């Protein structure tokens, strides 16, 4: 069980936390926990950040990477294919707050910092 404290505590850990690239920040929730489920992406940082994104990025954990498809299209940016298999492998449940920050390669690769409620 997920208490509303823990809940609380991880969404303050998670705000504290600042990377110095572009970042957004975002708490897991059961829509977007599912296979076959889709994740939109936030729509400033998708404007500023990734227009042209296409294709299966790098979505890094711990220094892992899980392929994740992700389209900017009609004006928004989706995670799909991939995305619940990256959270599924990773142990993340709802509740969990990601920190996705925009690392500085030559290809699109988003780090994650999870702050996880248990
Ligand atoms: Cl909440
Ligand atoms: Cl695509």
Same mark, same amino acid.
């Given at each position: ?25 975002? %708490? ?68 969990? %707050?990601? %920190? ?11 780090? %994650? ?6």
């Amino acid at each position: 069980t997920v208490t509303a404290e823990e809940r609380e505590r991880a969404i303050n850990a998670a705000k504290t936390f600042e990377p110095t690239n572009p970042f957004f920040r975002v %708490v897991l929730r059961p829509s977007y926990l599912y296979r076959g489920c889709i994740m939109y992406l936030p729509s400033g940082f998708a404007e500023k950040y990734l227009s042209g994104i296409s294709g299966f990025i790098k979505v890094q954990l711990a220094e892992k990477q899980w392929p994740v498809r992700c389209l900017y299209k009609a004006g928004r940016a989706k995670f799909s294919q991939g995305w619940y298999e990256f959270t599924l492998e990773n142990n993340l449940g709802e509740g969990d %707050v990601c %920190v996705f920050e925009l690392l500085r390669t030559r290809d699109f690769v988003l780090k %994650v910092t999870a702050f996880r409620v248990n």
